[PDB]
Design a binder for this molecule. Sequence first.
Ligand SMILES: *[C@@H]1O[C@H](CO)[C@@H](O)[C@H](O)[C@H]1NC(C)=O
Ligand SMILES: [Zn+2]
Length: 391
Amino acid sequence: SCPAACSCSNSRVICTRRELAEVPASIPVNTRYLNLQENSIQVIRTDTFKHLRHLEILQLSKNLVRKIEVGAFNGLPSLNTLELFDNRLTTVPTQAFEYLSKLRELWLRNNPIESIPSYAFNRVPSLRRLDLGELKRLEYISEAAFEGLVNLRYLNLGMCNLKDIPNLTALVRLEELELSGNRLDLIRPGSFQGLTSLRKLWLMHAQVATIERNAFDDLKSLEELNLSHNNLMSLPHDLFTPLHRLERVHLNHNPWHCNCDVLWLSWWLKETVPSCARCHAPAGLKGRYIGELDQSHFTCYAPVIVEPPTDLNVTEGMAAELKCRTGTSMTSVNWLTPNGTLMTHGSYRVRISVLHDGTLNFTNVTVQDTGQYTCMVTNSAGNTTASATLN
Ligand SMILES: *[C@@H]1O[C@H](CO)[C@@H](O)[C@H](O)[C@H]1NC(C)=O
Ligand SMILES: [Zn+2]
């Protein structure tokens, strides 16, 4: 029995383009597809979807939806996709989607949502796509927001004005990440730590001014990387070098400073060739393609350790530090322990870690860490090292 202002087929009901204030009651039991878009629905009550055990696609987008009650989606063991975009939701309805291991797609794009609470989507761990796009009024994301989503492949946090990248370490199977249209000032290694399966990353129009040393080294399956339209002047030495599957990169519309620090990039471009980034400065090279720069225009020498490490006598328990500040800040820094273990700002080791400065940090150090440590700095022109022991 088909409802009034709708169009039924076969298991497909179409009730679009009608001034409907609430969901119609007379819904057939055997329906998979259900379109309730371009209507004026404000509230979604508990158990509004009765006996819909065949429902795979439910579409509640482009409405004035303001409230989704507790257990609104009970009795839906077939639900695959759910659309709620272009609505007026001020939060995410955590309790609504109660026990749904069948839900694969979720679209909360373009709502006035203010935050993503701890364990927001824990009730739907089988998610594959999650669209949180155009959340212009978003003000805070929980560190434990994206817990439970171990099967998520796609995530959209575009057009949200994010100051910092939220915690994504929980998402071990992520393959595509949209972060465009944000205010992500600088990019850190730890931002992407634990995203080895990530293939595409989009940081277009992100107001990105700096990328830290070894910021991407963890993303060892990255193929597409869009840093177009940002405030990048330079990139650290050999940022992309270790990423071996990288084949589409957009570097255009950044104020590229073409000094000695760009030569690794011009060489990488000249080599890798994604198949158009131009020098914005200095005036001598303005509008020259970065990947066509030969080395003759530049005078470059080994990197200079402005602040080399001095020897330290330390107590067992207290903090410790061995400095390695350099000219420039883009020059790559590798440390070397007395073990023979090499280290980098990209590394994910507890306690001991190389801060963005280039300095090697400690916390709760032991006496058995005694030995000679060496800072190994490299740029486009050569290698330079300085070494000092700690006790
Ligand atoms: C640290 O101790 C070693 C000997 O154990 C000594 O060579 C060194 O001068 C000491 N450093 C300072 C300045 O206390
Ligand atoms: Zn350009």
